[PDB]
């Protein structure tokens, strides 16, 4: 008896950290929505309709959100599946040609700058012998002064080519699952406390992770899953200035957008098969893009990051709220997509603030753009054809991307400004409750048995 | 009882070795998508075959537990029975014989191909 | 903010053998860099997270430490060791230690 | 090879400003912060801040806000599109700014953070 | 300066290159090697 053998074990319980191509899961009402327009919700495999997490009790495992990888896979899938969708749609290389633009038909205070430059322009025809004027309509960010006439081009004429996204395409962010293959776990964080890094108690195994939306957005992320009791804080290295801080809500701060004029869109035959999507007249009034968020809810949640933040910089301290400290406008304001066209919201007023130791709402102004340059794009940039009527979207606030200045000097005034810049926070910031492991269930193990002769 | 699939991860070896055909099932079944789709697809089945691959150049095809032939050298862990079977976790116990369980393999390939080119010489005389 | 302090402020030691160069922080918790700048010349970075050498530094150069004491080991001493080093935690740098003939 | 590349040495009158302009190149200058370090005379190292190349987000040293501004280009070549200009610009300056200025950038192993500076510009002498 | 045996391997080429903008064009030069080009046809 004394002497032990060996047996070996299939179907044990154990795994290793790894790394591994994930795939897709979405609804069936995805594809209802046909139309031709979301991205690859049609390549991509269906979701569980009865849904499972086993819980996996007296385990703890060591988490860490800042050394993922299915956020850099995401981003990058997000980044290819959105090029893939541009490869039919039309080259507006003619487009790139001198412009001759005005302002448009307005009666406003010289303090008050043209945001809307009416472009006329010879264009191509159907035909290789002709050619036509033609004007449309153009937003001050998507030309440039170029040199008593006052002509212009495309801003993308010296930087990149471009492309009109096809409108029988959708911008909508739909859920996505991250489905692992095979004898590959995800192991998914519990814990309603947990800081993104570290040891967790409450954990569970699960095939694909939740419905999470690819909500491309500087400054304050929207949309996103919020927390179940304290507003988290969460970063690679808090100390250190240089990294940023992702804030993750507790409750909801609905916030409202839109552009106020009722634009048209006319239809310019570039030809054959090419044509281009002119904005057309401005049918009533020429108002300000802008969104609201109540000022009554925007100090109560920061109340809470503040109560949050002293956990980290002491009892005794003050923190206040600035606005962004320069840099590219993708960065320097709140962007994001609204029924289809780009914004450009000015946050200034949100992040205008002071906190010590011990009824309307915030209209915040916004611009708009049509070839656009996200991704940190170099080579190749897209238009956003004009969206016909009105435009106006609803939104919770799920959290933000702060940034302390690094001044110091042990000072209990170290303020915070909202940052941006890398999209890969934004997936950190939903990817924050999952790992991914390989799974190896060859055991082998002495128990006093041996085989037959 | 039926806890799920990796259920058993904090349970004590003896009571996770009860669980193994839960584990053992859930391991096979569960145009840019369309990729990925297919080398996870791949992956899966030689990641599969490669544990039957072992299983097979063993004697151990049956499968789940199954005895053999080379005897527990005491350097691998030297703990007695109570304390890894009714006491420590597979997590936890995978770590510490990890730094030989592909020499004590290479003990396994070896013992079987001698219990075949034996087992024949046995069926020969009779 | 986090104050470094270097000691000793000069050392001096003969090639061949082997200097510790100590970084005391404010603060504990943190890995600690090391830079060496010889006389006239550009920094050069030795050590990262406490104990990682940099790219092309040679296995002489030892670094250590945990919570607050931090270390620069530089084995067998080569007439290039001869220089000034400093510590760095983030923004944060200590003053310097110089190694001298 | 990483390469970053200063402009020269300059005398500044007090109230004057200064920029210094970093080229930077032999990898894809998106990708990495670069920041600026001043080592002065008696006193050390001061480090001034980063900048992002992407949009080009920045951060200054509490101390010296007001003072420092710091801007990128990046490069127009289309054959070579990868490298990009880093600028600093400092001002109101006093003798006490007399000091040699440092464009760096992090190393980029995996276990290499944000301020250990694998990669240094040859320095510019600033004499106020 | 090369004696007139020595055939001239560098010719350096003008031509109406194209603009980033369809309206224009540029007249731009570029140097071609001999195996490069092909004469067309007192220019
Ligand atoms: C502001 C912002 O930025 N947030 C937006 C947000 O606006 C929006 O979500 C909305 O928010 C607003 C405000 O928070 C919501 O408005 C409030 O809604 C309720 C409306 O009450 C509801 O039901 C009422 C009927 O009352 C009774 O009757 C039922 C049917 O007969 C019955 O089942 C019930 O028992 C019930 O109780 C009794 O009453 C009946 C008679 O009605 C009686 O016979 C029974 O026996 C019972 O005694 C009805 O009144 C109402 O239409 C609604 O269905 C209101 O109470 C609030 O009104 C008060 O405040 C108004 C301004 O705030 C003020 O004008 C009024 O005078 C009132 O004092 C208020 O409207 C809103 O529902 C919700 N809107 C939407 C679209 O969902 C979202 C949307 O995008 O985004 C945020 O970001
Ligand atoms: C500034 C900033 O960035 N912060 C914003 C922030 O503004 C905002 O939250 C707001 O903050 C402001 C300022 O901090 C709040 O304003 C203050 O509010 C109180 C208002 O007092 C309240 O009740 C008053 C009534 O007084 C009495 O009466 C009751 C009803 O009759 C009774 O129950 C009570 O007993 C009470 O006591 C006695 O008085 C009555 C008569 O009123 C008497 O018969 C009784 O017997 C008692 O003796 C009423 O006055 C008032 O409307 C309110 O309901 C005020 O005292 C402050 O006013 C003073 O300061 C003003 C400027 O600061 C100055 O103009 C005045 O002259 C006063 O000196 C002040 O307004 C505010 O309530 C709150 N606003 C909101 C919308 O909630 C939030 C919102 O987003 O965000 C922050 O970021």
Same mark, same amino acid.
């Given at each position: 008896?004394?002497?032990?053998? &060996?047996?070996?074990?299939?179907?044990?319980?154990?795994?290793?950290?790894?790394?591994?191509?994930?795939?897709?899961?979405?609804?069936?009402?995805?594809?209802?929505?046909?139309?031709?327009?979301?991205?690859?919700?049609?390549?991509?495999?269906?979701?569980?309709?009865?849904?499972?997490?086993?819980?996996?009790?007296?385990?703890?495992?060591?988490?860490?959100?800042?050394?993922?990888?299915?956020?850099?896979?995401?981003?990058?899938?997000?980044?290819?599946?959105?090029?893939?969708?541009?490869?039919?749609?039309?080259?507006?290389?003619?487009?790139? &040609?001198?412009?001759?633009?005005?302002?448009?038909?307005?009666?406003?205070?010289?303090?008050?700058?043209?945001?809307?430059?009416?472009?006329?322009?010879?264009?191509?025809?159907?035909?290789?012998?002709?050619?036509?004027?033609?004007?449309?309509?153009?937003?001050?960010?998507?030309?440039?002064?170029?040199?008593?006439?006052?002509?212009?081009?495309?801003?993308?004429?010296? @930087?990149?080519?471009? @492309?009109?996204?096809?409108?029988?395409?959708?911008?909508?962010?739909?859920?996505?699952?991250?489905?692992?293959?095979?004898?590959?776990? #995800?192991?998914?964080?519990?814990?309603?406390?947990?800081?993104?890094?570290?040891?967790?108690?409450?954990?569970?195994?699960?095939?694909?992770?939740?419905?999470?939306?690819? &909500?491309?957005?500087?400054?304050?992320?929207?949309?996103?899953?919020?927390?179940?009791?304290?507003?988290?804080?969460?970063?690679?290295?808090?100390?250190?200035?240089?990294?940023? #801080?992702?804030?993750?809500?507790?409750?909801?701060?609905?916030?409202?957008?839109?552009?106020?004029?009722?634009?048209?869109?006319?239809?310019?035959?570039?030809?054959?098969?090419?044509?281009?999507?002119?904005?057309?007249?401005?049918? %009533?009034?020429?108002?300000?893009?802008?969104?609201?968020?109540?000022?009554?809810?925007?100090?109560?949640?920061?109340?809470?990051?503040?109560?949050?933040?002293?956990?980290?910089?002491?009892?005794?301290?003050?923190?206040?709220?600035?606005?962004?400290?320069?840099?590219?406008?993708?960065?320097?304001?709140?962007?994001?997509?609204?029924?289809?066209?780009?914004?450009?919201?000015?946050?200034?007023?949100?992040?205008?603030? @002071?906190?010590?130791?011990?009824?309307?709402?915030?209209?915040?102004?916004?611009?708009?753009?049509?070839?656009?340059?996200?991704?940190?794009?170099?080579?190749?940039?897209?238009?956003? $054809? $004009?969206?016909?009527?009105? #435009?106006?979207?609803?939104?919770?606030?799920?959290?933000?991307?702060?940034?302390?200045?690094?001044?110091?000097?042990?000072?209990?005034?170290? @303020?915070?400004?909202?940052? %941006?810049?890398?999209?890969?926070?934004?997936?950190?910031?939903?990817?924050?409750?999952?790992? &991914?492991?390989? #799974?190896?269930?060859?055991?082998?193990?002495?128990?006093?048995?041996?085989?037959?002769? | 009882?039926?806890?799920?699939?990796?259920?058993? *991860?904090?349970?004590? +070896?003896?009571?996770?070795? +009860?669980?193994?055909?839960?584990?053992?099932?859930?391991?096979?079944?569960?145009?840019?998508?369309?990729?990925?789709?297919?080398? *996870?697809?791949?992956?899966?089945?030689?990641?599969?075959?490669?544990?039957?691959?072992?299983?097979?150049?063993?004697?151990?095809?049956?499968?789940?537990?199954?005895?053999?032939?080379?005897?527990?050298?005491?350097?691998?862990?030297?703990?007695?029975?109570?304390?890894?079977?009714?006491? +420590?976790?597979?997590?936890?116990?995978?770590?510490?014989?990890?730094?030989?369980?592909?020499?004590?393999?290479?003990?396994?390939?070896?013992?079987?191909?001698?219990?075949?080119?034996?087992?024949?010489?046995?069926? *020969?005389?009779? | 903010?986090? =104050?470094?302090?270097?000691?000793?402020?000069?050392?001096?030691?003969?090639?061949?053998?082997?200097?510790?160069?100590?970084?005391?922080?404010?603060?504990?918790?943190?890995?600690?860099?090391?830079?060496?700048?010889?006389?006239?010349? =550009?920094?050069?970075?030795?050590?990262?997270?406490?104990?990682?050498?940099?790219?092309?530094?040679?296995?002489?150069?030892?670094?250590?430490?945990?919570?607050?004491?931090?270390?620069?080991?530089?084995?067998?001493?080569?007439?290039?060791?001869?220089?000034?080093?400093?510590?760095?935690?983030?923004?944060?740098?200590?003053?310097?230690?110089?190694?001298? =003939? | 090879?990483?390469?970053?590349?200063?402009?020269?040495?300059?005398?500044?009158?007090?109230? /004057?400003?200064?920029?210094? /302009?970093?080229?930077?190149?032999?990898?894809?200058?998106?990708?990495?912060?670069?920041?600026?370090?001043?080592?002065?005379?008696?006193?050390?190292?001061?480090?001034?801040?980063?900048?992002?190349?992407?949009?080009?987000?920045?951060?200054?040293?509490?101390?010296?806000?007001?003072?420092?501004?710091?801007?990128?280009?990046? /490069?127009?070549?289309?054959?070579?599109?990868?490298?990009?200009?880093?600028?600093?610009?400092?001002?109101?300056?006093?003798?006490?700014?007399?000091?040699?200025?440092?464009?760096?950038?992090?190393?980029?192993?995996?276990?290499?953070?944000?301020?250990?500076?694998?990669?240094?510009?040859?320095?510019?002498?600033?004499?106020?």
């Amino acid at each position: 008896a004394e002497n032990l053998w &060996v047996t070996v074990y299939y179907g044990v319980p154990v795994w290793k950290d790894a790394e591994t191509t994930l795939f897709c899961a979405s609804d069936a009402k995805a594809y209802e929505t046909e139309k031709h327009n979301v991205w690859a919700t049609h390549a991509c495999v269906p979701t569980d309709p009865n849904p499972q997490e086993i819980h996996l009790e007296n385990v703890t495992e060591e988490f860490n959100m800042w050394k993922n990888n299915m956020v850099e896979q995401m981003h990058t899938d997000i980044i290819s599946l959105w090029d893939q969708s541009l490869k039919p749609c039309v080259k507006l290389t003619p487009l790139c &040609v001198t412009l001759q633009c005005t302002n448009v038909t307005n009666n406003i205070t010289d303090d008050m700058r043209g945001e809307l430059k009416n472009c006329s322009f010879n264009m191509t025809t159907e035909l290789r012998d002709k050619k036509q004027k033609v004007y449309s309509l153009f937003y001050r960010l998507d030309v440039v002064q170029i040199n008593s006439n006052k002509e212009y081009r495309l801003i993308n004429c010296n @930087t990149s080519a471009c @492309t009109q996204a096809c409108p029988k395409v959708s911008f909508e962010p739909i859920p996505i699952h991250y489905c692992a293959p095979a004898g590959f776990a #995800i192991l998914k964080c519990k814990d309603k406390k947990f800081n993104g890094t570290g040891p967790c108690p409450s954990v569970s195994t699960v095939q694909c992770t939740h419905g999470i939306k690819p &909500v491309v957005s500087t400054q304050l992320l929207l949309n996103g899953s919020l927390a179940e009791e304290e507003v988290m804080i969460r970063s690679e290295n808090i100390t250190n200035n240089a990294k940023n #801080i992702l804030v993750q809500f507790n409750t909801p701060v609905q916030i409202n957008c839109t552009r106020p004029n009722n634009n048209t869109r006319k239809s310019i035959r570039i030809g054959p098969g090419q044509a281009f999507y002119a904005t057309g007249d401005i049918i %009533g009034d020429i108002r300000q893009a802008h969104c609201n968020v109540s000022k009554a809810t925007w100090n109560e949640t920061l109340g809470k990051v503040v109560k949050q933040l002293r956990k980290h910089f002491g009892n005794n301290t003050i923190i206040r709220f600035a606005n962004s400290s320069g840099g590219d406008l993708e960065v320097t304001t709140h962007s994001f997509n609204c029924g289809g066209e780009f914004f450009y919201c000015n946050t200034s007023g949100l992040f205008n603030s @002071t906190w010590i130791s011990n009824n309307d709402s915030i209209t915040l102004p916004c611009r708009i753009k049509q070839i656009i340059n996200m991704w940190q794009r170099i080579g190749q940039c897209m238009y956003a $054809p $004009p969206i016909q009527g009105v #435009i106006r979207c609803v939104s919770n606030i799920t959290g933000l991307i702060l940034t302390r200045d690094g001044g110091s000097t042990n000072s209990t005034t170290e @303020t915070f400004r909202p940052g %941006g810049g890398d999209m890969r926070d934004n997936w950190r910031s939903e990817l924050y409750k999952y790992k &991914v492991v390989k #799974i190896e269930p060859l055991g082998v193990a002495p128990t006093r048995c041996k085989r037959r002769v | 009882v039926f806890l799920g699939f990796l259920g058993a *991860a904090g349970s004590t +070896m003896g009571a996770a070795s +009860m669980t193994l055909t839960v584990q053992a099932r859930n391991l096979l079944s569960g145009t840019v998508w369309g990729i990925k789709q297919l080398q *996870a697809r791949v992956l899966a089945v030689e990641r599969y075959l490669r544990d039957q691959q072992l299983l097979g150049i063993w004697g151990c095809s049956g499968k789940l537990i199954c005895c053999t032939n080379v005897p527990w050298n005491s350097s691998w862990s030297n703990r007695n029975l109570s304390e890894i079977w009714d006491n +420590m976790t597979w997590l936890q116990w995978d770590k510490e014989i990890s730094n030989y369980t592909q020499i004590i393999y290479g003990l396994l390939e070896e013992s079987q191909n001698q219990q075949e080119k034996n087992e024949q010489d046995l069926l *020969a005389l009779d | 903010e986090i =104050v470094l302090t270097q000691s000793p402020g000069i050392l001096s030691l003969s090639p061949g053998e082997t200097a510790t160069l100590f970084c005391k922080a404010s603060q504990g918790g943190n890995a600690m860099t090391w830079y060496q700048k010889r006389r006239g010349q =550009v920094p050069r970075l030795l050590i990262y997270d406490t104990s990682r050498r940099a790219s092309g530094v040679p296995d002489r150069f030892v670094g250590s430490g945990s919570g607050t004491d931090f270390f620069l080991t530089i084995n067998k001493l080569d007439r290039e060791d001869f220089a000034v080093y400093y510590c760095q935690q983030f923004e944060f740098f200590g003053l310097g230690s110089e190694l001298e =003939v | 090879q990483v390469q970053l590349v200063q402009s020269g040495a300059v005398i500044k009158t007090p109230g /004057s400003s200064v920029k210094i /302009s970093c080229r930077a190149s032999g990898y894809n200058f998106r990708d990495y912060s670069i920041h600026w370090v001043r080592l002065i005379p008696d006193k050390g190292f001061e480090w001034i801040g980063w900048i992002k190349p992407l949009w080009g987000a920045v951060s200054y040293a509490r101390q010296l806000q007001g003072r420092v501004s710091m801007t990128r280009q990046l /490069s127009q070549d289309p054959d070579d599109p990868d490298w990009g200009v880093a600028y600093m610009e400092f001002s109101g300056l006093t003798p006490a700014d007399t000091a040699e200025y440092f464009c760096v950038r992090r190393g980029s192993c995996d276990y290499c953070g944000d301020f250990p500076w694998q990669y240094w510009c040859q320095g510019t002498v600033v004499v106020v």
